[PDB]
Ligand binder design. Structure first.
Ligand SMILES: [K+]
Ligand SMILES: [K+]
Ligand SMILES: [K+]
Ligand SMILES: [K+]
Ligand SMILES: [K+]
Ligand SMILES: [Mg+2]
Ligand SMILES: [Mg+2]
Ligand SMILES: [Mg+2]
Ligand SMILES: [Mg+2]
Ligand SMILES: [Mg+2]
Ligand SMILES: [Mg+2]
Ligand SMILES: [Mg+2]
Ligand SMILES: [Mg+2]
Ligand SMILES: [Mg+2]
Ligand SMILES: [Mg+2]
Ligand SMILES: [Mg+2]
Ligand SMILES: [Mg+2]
Ligand SMILES: [Mg+2]
Ligand SMILES: [Mg+2]
Ligand SMILES: [Mg+2]
Ligand SMILES: [Mg+2]
Ligand SMILES: [Mg+2]
Ligand SMILES: [Mg+2]
Ligand SMILES: [Mg+2]
Ligand SMILES: [Mg+2]
Ligand SMILES: [Mg+2]
Ligand SMILES: [Mg+2]
Ligand SMILES: [Mg+2]
Ligand SMILES: [Mg+2]
Ligand SMILES: [Mg+2]
Ligand SMILES: [Mg+2]
Ligand SMILES: [Mg+2]
Ligand SMILES: [Mg+2]
Ligand SMILES: [Mg+2]
Lengths: 47, 197, 108
RNA sequence: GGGUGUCCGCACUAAGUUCGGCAUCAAUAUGGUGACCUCCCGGGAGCGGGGGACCACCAGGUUGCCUAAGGAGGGGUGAACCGGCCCAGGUCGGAAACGGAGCAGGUCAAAACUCCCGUGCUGAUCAGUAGUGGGAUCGCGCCUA
């Protein structure tokens, strides 16, 4: 219930995105993390 | 501080094949484990295109975790040797490779014993390593049929493991009593080869 | 007794030839490119019935050149088996003598 | 009410999967094979009989104060002419019997190339399985009078 406070919980429109928590690739923001993967691949690979 | 060597080897071997006698598999797991330990601890022997000697110095010995690495070198050799002893019944030149390995197995244990001479390691691990080195010295100097040195190392080994067994619970003592019972027949064989003259 | 003379071909003494090539004496003692002409001159000079066959060549000599051309014949024994000279009782000894003297003629 | 899963650019550990770079130690006793060297014996030549020293390749018997390892591994393939062997012709020695250096021609592949198995060190790989944790928690299950 901490919710990083809770006033705001009802203040910006009552709740977070209804998709909310669930698979992050599944949500409707729908980001698939391209250049961040690529930056992390290249990072791990090169050592 | 601590390290229950005999227990490590017995359970590892029992889990990864020697229960049905697969020295080739156990050597394999022993190798894979060294690879995991090395990759985790960022302690690499060789970077692509060059090789560097791994020296397990005294500092990193605080980790009570690195000794296992050398112990795995020693177990790897020892396993390969027994594997050859099985392949030599039909290839006798294999015997020569066998002896080479046991010698390195003993060499690792002696260096490993040297590591446990550090003031950073507890008495119980010093005795476990002394007993391990004595034991391999014994198996080598047994395959050379050099009975007096073999019985010297086995009596050193028996005396040490008996010292450890008399100090703790009979429940934990069971393993140590099992090692002495485990090498007793070689002891009797050594005696019968000495008292022949 | 013409046709029972022993044979000496140049190659037996040519130090720049090998044993498979016909050499019979140690390299230390042989000499460079000795010729049949030179061998005859030394053996007639020491008192041996010798004659030069300018027209005979050693089978083992591939080079068809004057320096390798030649065969020298030496009479070693009389019909009754006795030595012509006690000093040269065998083929080997003749070869060695040839090699010893050859450098003194016109090498200078 | 609590605990816990459902959530994350999370973390540690352990057993795994898939895949690329590099590297592959020697000393010997003995036997076979080839070259050179060096001794004898016999012959009128060609040459015939035999003895040692040493080099390099194979085998493979005993060994290690050589290791990060380093086996006496396998597969494809691989032939000049300044390699071996068989050498018509021809040439040289021979009276001949035949023999020598050997062209042309045909011919034979040990090595080196190369791909693995084995062994060692690597560098990664999986929107990853298991176990213990962390941040997170309105929604949703499950466990608790
Ligand atoms: K083949
Ligand atoms: K040819
Ligand atoms: K011919
Ligand atoms: K021949
Ligand atoms: K929750
Ligand atoms: Mg055991
Ligand atoms: Mg060996
Ligand atoms: Mg022995
Ligand atoms: Mg979130
Ligand atoms: Mg060496
Ligand atoms: Mg040598
Ligand atoms: Mg040595
Ligand atoms: Mg050898
Ligand atoms: Mg043999
Ligand atoms: Mg002799
Ligand atoms: Mg001869
Ligand atoms: Mg001969
Ligand atoms: Mg092979
Ligand atoms: Mg293949
Ligand atoms: Mg060649
Ligand atoms: Mg043919
Ligand atoms: Mg002919
Ligand atoms: Mg003819
Ligand atoms: Mg003729
Ligand atoms: Mg012919
Ligand atoms: Mg023939
Ligand atoms: Mg040809
Ligand atoms: Mg490859
Ligand atoms: Mg194999
Ligand atoms: Mg969790
Ligand atoms: Mg959690
Ligand atoms: Mg976190
Ligand atoms: Mg976070
Ligand atoms: Mg909490």
């Amino acid at each position: 219930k901490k919710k990083g406070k809770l006033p705001k919980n009802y203040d910006p429109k009552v709740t977070p995105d209804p998709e909310r928590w669930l698979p992050m690739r599944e949500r409707s923001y729908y980001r698939g993390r391209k250049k961040g993967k690529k930056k992390d691949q290249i990072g791990k690979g090169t050592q | 501080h601590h390290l229950e060597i005999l227990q490590i080897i017995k359970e590892s071997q029992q889990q990864h094949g020697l229960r049905h006698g697969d020295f080739q598999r156990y050597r394999g797991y022993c190798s894979r484990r060294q690879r995991r330990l090395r990759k985790t601890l960022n302690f690499k022997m060789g970077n692509r295109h060059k090789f560097t000697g791994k020296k397990v110095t005294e500092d990193l010995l605080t980790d009570n975790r690195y000794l296992l690495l050398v112990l795995m070198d020693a177990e790897r050799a020892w396993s390969y040797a027994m594997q050859l002893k099985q392949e030599a019944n039909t290839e006798p030149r294999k015997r020569f490779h066998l002896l080479s390995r046991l010698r390195k197995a003993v060499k690792h244990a002696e260096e490993l014993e040297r590591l446990c001479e550090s003031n950073r390691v507890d008495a119980k691990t010093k005795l476990e390593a002394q007993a391990y080195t004595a034991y391999l010295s014994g198996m080598l100097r047994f395959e050379h049929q050099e009975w007096k040195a073999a019985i010297e190392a086995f009596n050193k080994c028996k005396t040490i493991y008996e010292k450890l067994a008399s100090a703790f619970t009979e429940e934990q003592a069971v393993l140590y009593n099992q090692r002495v019972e485990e090498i007793s027949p070689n002891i009797r064989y050594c005696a019968y080869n000495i008292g022949d003259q | 007794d013409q046709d029972r003379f022993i044979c000496i071909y140049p190659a037996y003494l040519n130090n720049k030839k090998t044993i498979a090539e016909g050499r019979r004496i140690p390299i230390s003692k042989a000499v460079e490119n000795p010729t049949a002409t030179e061998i005859q001159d030394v053996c007639s000079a020491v008192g041996l019935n010798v004659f030069l066959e300018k027209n005979k060549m050693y089978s083992r000599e591939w080079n068809r050149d004057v320096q390798y051309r030649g065969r020298v014949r030496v009479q070693l024994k009389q019909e009754d088996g006795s030595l012509c000279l006690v000093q040269f009782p065998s083929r080997k000894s003749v070869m060695l003598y040839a090699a010893e003297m050859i450098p003194k003629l016109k090498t200078r």
